Amino acid sequence: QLSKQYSSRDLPSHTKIKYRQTTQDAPEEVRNRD
Amino acid sequence: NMLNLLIHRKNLNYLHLDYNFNLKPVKTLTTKERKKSRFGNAFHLCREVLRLTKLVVDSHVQYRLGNVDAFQLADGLQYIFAHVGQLTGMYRYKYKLMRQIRMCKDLKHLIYYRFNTGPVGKGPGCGFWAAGWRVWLFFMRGITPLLERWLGNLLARQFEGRHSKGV
Amino acid sequence: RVALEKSVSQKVAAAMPVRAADKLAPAQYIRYTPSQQGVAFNSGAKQR
Amino acid sequence: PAHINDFMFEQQRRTFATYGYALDPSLDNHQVSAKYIGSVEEAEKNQGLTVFETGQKKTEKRKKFKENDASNIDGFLGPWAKYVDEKDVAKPSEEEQKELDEITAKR
Amino acid sequence: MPKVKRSRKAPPDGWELIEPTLDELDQKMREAETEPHEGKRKVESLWPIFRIHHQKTRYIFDLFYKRKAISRELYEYCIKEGYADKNLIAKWKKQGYENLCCLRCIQTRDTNFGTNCICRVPKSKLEVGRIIECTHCGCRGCS
Amino acid sequence: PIMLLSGHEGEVYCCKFHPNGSTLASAGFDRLILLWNVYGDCDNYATLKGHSGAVMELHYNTDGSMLFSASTDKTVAVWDSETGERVKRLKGHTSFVNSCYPARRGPQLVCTGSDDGTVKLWDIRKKAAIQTFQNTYQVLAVTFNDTSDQIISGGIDNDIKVWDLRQNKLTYTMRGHADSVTGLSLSSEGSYLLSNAMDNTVRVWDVRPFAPKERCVKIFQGNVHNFEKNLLRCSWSPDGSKIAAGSADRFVYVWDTTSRRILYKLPGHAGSINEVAFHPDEPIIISASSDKRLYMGEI
Amino acid sequence: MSEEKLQEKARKWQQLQAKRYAEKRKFGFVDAQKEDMPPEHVRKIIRDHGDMTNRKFRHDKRVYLGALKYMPHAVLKLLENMPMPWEQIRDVPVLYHITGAISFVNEIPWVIEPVYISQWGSMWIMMRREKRDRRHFKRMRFPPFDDEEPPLDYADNILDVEPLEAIQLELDPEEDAPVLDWFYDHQPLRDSRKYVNGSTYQRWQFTLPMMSTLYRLANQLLTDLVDDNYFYLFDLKAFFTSKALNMAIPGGPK
Amino acid sequence: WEDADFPILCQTCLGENPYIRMTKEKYGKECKICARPFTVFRWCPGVRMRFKKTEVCQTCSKLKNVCQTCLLDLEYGLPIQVRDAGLSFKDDMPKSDVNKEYYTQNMEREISNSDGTRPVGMLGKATSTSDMLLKLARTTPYYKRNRPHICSFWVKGECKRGEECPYRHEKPTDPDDPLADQNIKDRYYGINDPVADKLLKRASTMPRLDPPEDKTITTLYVGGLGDTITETDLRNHFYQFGEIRTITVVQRQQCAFIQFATRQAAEVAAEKSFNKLIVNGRRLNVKWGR
Ligand SMILES: O=P(O)(O)O[C@H]1[C@@H](OP(=O)(O)O)[C@@H](OP(=O)(O)O)[C@@H](OP(=O)(O)O)[C@@H](OP(=O)(O)O)[C@H]1OP(=O)(O)O
Numbered sequence A: 001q002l003s004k005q006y007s008s009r010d011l012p013s014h015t016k017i018k019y020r021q022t023t024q025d026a027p028e029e030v031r032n033r034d
Numbered sequence B: 001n002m003l004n005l006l007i008h009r010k011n012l013n014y015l016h017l018d019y020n021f022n023l024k025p026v027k028t029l030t031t032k033e034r035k036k037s038r039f040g041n042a043f044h045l046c047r048e049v050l051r052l053t054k055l056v057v058d059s060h061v062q063y064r065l066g067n068v069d070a071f072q073l074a075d076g077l078q079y080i081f082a083h084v085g086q087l088t089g090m091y092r093y094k095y096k097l098m099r100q101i102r103m104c105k106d107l108k109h110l111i112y113y114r115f116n117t118g119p120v121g122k123g124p125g126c127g128f129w130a131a132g133w134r135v136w137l138f139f140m141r142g143i144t145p146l147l148e149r150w151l152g153n154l155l156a157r158q159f160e161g162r163h164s165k166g167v
Numbered sequence C: 001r002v003a004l005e006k007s008v009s010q011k012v013a014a015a016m017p018v019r020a021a022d023k024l025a026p027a028q029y030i031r032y033t034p035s036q037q038g039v040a041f042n043s044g045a046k047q048r
Numbered sequence D: 001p002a003h004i005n006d007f008m009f010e011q012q013r014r015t016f017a018t019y020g021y022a023l024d025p026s027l028d029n030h031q032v033s034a035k036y037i038g039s040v041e042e043a044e045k046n047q048g049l050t051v052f053e054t055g056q057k058k059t060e061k062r063k064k065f066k067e068n069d070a071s072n073i074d075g076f077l078g079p080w081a082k083y084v085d086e087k088d089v090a091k092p093s094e095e096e097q098k099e100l101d102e103i104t105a106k107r
Numbered sequence E: 001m002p003k004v005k006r007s008r009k010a011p012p013d014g015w016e017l018i019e020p021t022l023d024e025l026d027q028k029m030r031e032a033e034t035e036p037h038e039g040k041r042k043v044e045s046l047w048p049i050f051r052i053h054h055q056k057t058r059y060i061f062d063l064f065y066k067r068k069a070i071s072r073e074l075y076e077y078c079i080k081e082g083y084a085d086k087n088l089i090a091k092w093k094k095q096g097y098e099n100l101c102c103l104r105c106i107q108t109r110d111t112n113f114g115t116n117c118i119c120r121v122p123k124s125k126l127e128v129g130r131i132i133e134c135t136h137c138g139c140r141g142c143s
Numbered sequence F: 001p002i003m004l005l006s007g008h009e010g011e012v013y014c015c016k017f018h019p020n021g022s023t024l025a026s027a028g029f030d031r032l033i034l035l036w037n038v039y040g041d042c043d044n045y046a047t048l049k050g051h052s053g054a055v056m057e058l059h060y061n062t063d064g065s066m067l068f069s070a071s072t073d074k075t076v077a078v079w080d081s082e083t084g085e086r087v088k089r090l091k092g093h094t095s096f097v098n099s100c101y102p103a104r105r106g107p108q109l110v111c112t113g114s115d116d117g118t119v120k121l122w123d124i125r126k127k128a129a130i131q132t133f134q135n136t137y138q139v140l141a142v143t144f145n146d147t148s149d150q151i152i153s154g155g156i157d158n159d160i161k162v163w164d165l166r167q168n169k170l171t172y173t174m175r176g177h178a179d180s181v182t183g184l185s186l187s188s189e190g191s192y193l194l195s196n197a198m199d200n201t202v203r204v205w206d207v208r209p210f211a212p213k214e215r216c217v218k219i220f221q222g223n224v225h226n227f228e229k230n231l232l233r234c235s236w237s238p239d240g241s242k243i244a245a246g247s248a249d250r251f252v253y254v255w256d257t258t259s260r261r262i263l264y265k266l267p268g269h270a271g272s273i274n275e276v277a278f279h280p281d282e283p284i285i286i287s288a289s290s291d292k293r294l295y296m297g298e299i
Numbered sequence G: 001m002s003e004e005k006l007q008e009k010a011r012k013w014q015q016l017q018a019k020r021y022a023e024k025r026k027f028g029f030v031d032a033q034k035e036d037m038p039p040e041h042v043r044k045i046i047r048d049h050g051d052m053t054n055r056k057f058r059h060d061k062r063v064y065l066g067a068l069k070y071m072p073h074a075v076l077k078l079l080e081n082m083p084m085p086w087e088q089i090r091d092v093p094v095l096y097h098i099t100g101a102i103s104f105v106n107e108i109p110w111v112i113e114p115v116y117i118s119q120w121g122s123m124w125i126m127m128r129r130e131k132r133d134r135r136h137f138k139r140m141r142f143p144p145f146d147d148e149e150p151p152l153d154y155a156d157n158i159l160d161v162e163p164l165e166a167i168q169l170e171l172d173p174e175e176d177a178p179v180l181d182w183f184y185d186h187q188p189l190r191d192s193r194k195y196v197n198g199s200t201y202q203r204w205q206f207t208l209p210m211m212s213t214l215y216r217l218a219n220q221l222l223t224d225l226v227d228d229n230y231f232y233l234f235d236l237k238a239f240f241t242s243k244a245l246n247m248a249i250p251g252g253p254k
Numbered sequence H: 001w002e003d004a005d006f007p008i009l010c011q012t013c014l015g016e017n018p019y020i021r022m023t024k025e026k027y028g029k030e031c032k033i034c035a036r037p038f039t040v041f042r043w044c045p046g047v048r049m050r051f052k053k054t055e056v057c058q059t060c061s062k063l064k065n066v067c068q069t070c071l072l073d074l075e076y077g078l079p080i081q082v083r084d085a086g087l088s089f090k091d092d093m094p095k096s097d098v099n100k101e102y103y104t105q106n107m108e109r110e111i112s113n114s115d116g117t118r119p120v121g122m123l124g125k126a127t128s129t130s131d132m133l134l135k136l137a138r139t140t141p142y143y144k145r146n147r148p149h150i151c152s153f154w155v156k157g158e159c160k161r162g163e164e165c166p167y168r169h170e171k172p173t174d175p176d177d178p179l180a181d182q183n184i185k186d187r188y189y190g191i192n193d194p195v196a197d198k199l200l201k202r203a204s205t206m207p208r209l210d211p212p213e214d215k216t217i218t219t220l221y222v223g224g225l226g227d228t229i230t231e232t233d234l235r236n237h238f239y240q241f242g243e244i245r246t247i248t249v250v251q252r253q254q255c256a257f258i259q260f261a262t263r264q265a266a267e268v269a270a271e272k273s274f275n276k277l278i279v280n281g282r283r284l285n286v287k288w289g290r
């Protein structure tokens, strides 16, 4: 029982996840750090 | 036919949409019907867009029947596109239209005040309808996904029913 | 990750609702063994 | 979930449809032989002929018309040529007619 | 009042002997087009049109290929103005397809199992003498 | 492991190993030839292209240097496993060429069985035919004899036929199969030859200078046919120890040369198994089935 | 075993194998096409359904309604092909629903750029000389049809009429030799592989006399500037800067 | 919404050819009982037979254990009421709107936790097929079910479609007959379905062995014995069923007379054997002797 209604706010948006880059604080560095 | 099928499916027999897409009641309606029979901006935006196209295709039918002329058709089309504000009444339902409306005024002041640079006069016969046509085509490029969403929602709600459970 | 995201994909494709309708998958073939086997019905054969 | 070949399934089905016998499809774990199922004696006497395989049949084809000159204004039957051995009206007759009136009254 | 012509080019000059046949055929098409939707049926109210359409293009197919009684130029003018049917013809010219009823009776995607009408099955391989009315064209076994 | 391979769009009819035991070739309806690496993850490196019809039989040379592949479109093809590219398009076949066999350890020479009514002998270098024994009818499988001087063929008339390359007459005709023979494969003995036939029986024969005049040796039960009449193919093991067969029953049949017992009827497939491939080195089995994929069984 | 047995065996298996591996059901073969219907098919369906009030249909009611979601597409596709005052009639490819519920003009109006500007420039000259030299211009009435006059039928009212000469400018035979014939066509050189790509109508290539006459014809709608230092502080970058500094040059935007 | 792999149908209704071609439509219609949307499968039964369609949810099927279109039981194949009575079942599925939608929701939630293998509930606890059920069962496929309807036109004369009349151009059945009006809802709920009552009267008129008056008449007469039976064979017929006290195998009349040790044992034996004790192919007639 799936509706075909819809919403202005369920349009696609921010469809890519940012990942924490090499210098910002990647889980590798924090794995290292003291 | 689509808009009439909508009107009559909701069981609103006291209203009727006439052939230039005017919506008119055929009674005087009590409160319950003045309320039950209010419509939204989807219905009315679709109504008014269809009214613009009927104006256009009927100018062309007048041309093809022999009633007017090539020049009268061209200038009447230019007229139509310059004066969408006073012929449709679209701005009531999506007021952002005035972008377009102001644009088709600016163009007309250009073209006119370059059309009649010499002995040519301030009279009607100026149909160079490329510019306003372009403008309303870009407007339609923008509006079709919006209206397809709004009408999809209206039709769904009319055929499934409105969901008052987990709002 | 696999199961999660596939269910995501179906739930969001619901939120597409303008379904970029893909073609219908090729016709499948299924082989069926009735419980009511015998030569009374199935023209004496067992499977269809 | 089988996966079979396509010309062959339709061949066998049309066989069983228009001839009444067919190479039975049971793929049993006990090795059965090719047995013509359905009208077995028909498969025997007809030599297993398929509706798709050409075969000798002296069967009287129903008589049809043929008006294929497309210049006659009301002439061309072309591909829409009726069968000549066909009826010109379709109705039930005096006894069944009154009986059906009686039934429609009984209902 | 005829199929008023778009080309504005002069018709090549066999046009004057095939003129009246096409004219009466268009008369018949307009008439059988307006014939109003009686208690006839809803599937079969469109069978006249396909019937007439085949006729007209069939006719020209004769007068160019089976008689060679008109020129390439006149025949092309008669296609371009919508009397004939370019692809119904180009299909007729094939080998298994001499009498094809309507061009839609071979559309494989318009039918759910991916086949042609029973219109298209040779009468012999059915042999059951059963009346065939392809719902599309109304044809009785085009081939 | 089971190691099922996929990546083929339609039935795979033929699968066989590198005679190295290094690379895998499979082919079928999709009109192209896929290659894989047998070891590691059983991964796919190359795909050969070109054959317009269905690849009905692929065949190696005995080193593994050039590839032979019989196509439905009246043609055989030899290609370079070095490149994957065509060296020769054996045209001239007047119908469906189903079976191909390159001469092993002799001069480079090919016998092709076809649906025209002829068996054809071809030299790769001349772009011309060598010999052709028009018996009457379709020949469905063809294999040489290790002398490269007789040629064996099996078709619709159930009498397995062998021609002498020098006298060019029907050298050896053998009889006893009740219905059409679908597969021949001569063991690496150079002597024992294996015959599948959809009458549900498999047979073993032996081409020698001297044979008992009626050389129907061993007989096994189990294979199936049905409305499909797909082409069923058999093989010996590298050792002449186990015979592997497929059938339209979804069961890989593994029997033994010695006790003719049913060592295996293995399930696992979805559609008819058309070809089983034995590893020239290992106890590795590869099944090509009409379910549009392959299996890599280890025994 | 019986010979005639084996002979009809060869017969049967030959036919069977032959059809089964016929090129028709080869692997990647895709069925050819969907070619055009006749026009009267559409015309008859739509005039039949009329206004869905006769209960004989009563099921296309649901699809008729449900097709509303797409009518802003039909309108956009329709209005972007309107026939351009040098033409009397334009024929367009139409995709429609087999119950008449909706009708999409299925086309994109590609034009050659210098041709198009020249055609509209001729229109400029003609319109102007006409409005100057017509005694009294009558403006048509909007709406042209009344509120309860039902819309006309094409077939009964416009189908057979003669269509009333359009706004051609009449080109002179000597100086405009290279264009006089194909100028006012719908898609001028559509089918002549010397000057156009093909029938999809991309890629023009033209002769230099063609271009010179086209230029001279479109001369009215054109700038007689030759270089760029006219727009000195009047280009995009000057405006970007002025906007950024919130100062505004004499004749520029704010 | 339901979602299935195939229909679940009677062999009668599935057709005759081994090779059938069938179409699926996802969320295609509404179960006439479950009231919710289902997937609807449509197949052509045979040559010149109406296309049939699955007409009840897969859950509405598994619950009462029937064929999704034929509606008859799956093993025996009688109307739902008959099977219920023969299994002595009491099916408590609600009737009113809200209660029935609620019951359907929870029954579906609980059948989600199944294996898809056998009916849920008492339909497993009632599979003891009584000889009455086996006795009423259909034997061969009554394939008259799949022929087309009755042509209103051809009943009035009008079926001018030649031979293609979309309905059997025969005589319309008299509407007075009880076997005419059986609404789907009742035939699923088993409340006053005429075919059930006619079949039950038929099962009541069917031959079963009669009981005697006196308790002391503990000799049971089996008629139609034949001389291929042994006294030890008549024993094995009536030995472990209780205890037998004596056996007289009358060879001058081809009959037998079994004196038992327990009245209920002999009664169960003979009634359960009535005309159907088929040992070495002999129709023995089990009755109480004089
Ligand atoms: O009614 P509007 O949208 O405002 O357009 C008109 C009109 O244009 P149409 O010819 O399309 O009706 C006039 O044109 P002419 O009278 O020039 O022929 C005129 O424009 P002019 O000012 O140039 O006369 C007039 O303007 P106004 O009321 O100021 O005279 C006005 O255009 P505006 O947008 O200029 O008002």
Ligand SMILES: [Zn+2]
Pocket (backbone or CB within 6 Å): E105, E117, E118, E119, E120, E133, E134, E135, E136, E137, E139
């Ligand atoms: Zn048809």
Ligand SMILES: [Zn+2]
Pocket (backbone or CB within 6 Å): E101, E102, E103, E104, E105, E119, E134, E136, E137, E138, E139
């Ligand atoms: Zn047709």
Ligand SMILES: [Zn+2]
Pocket (backbone or CB within 6 Å): D079, E100, E101, E102, E105, E119, E120, E134, E137, E139, E140, E141, E142, E143
């Ligand atoms: Zn036809």
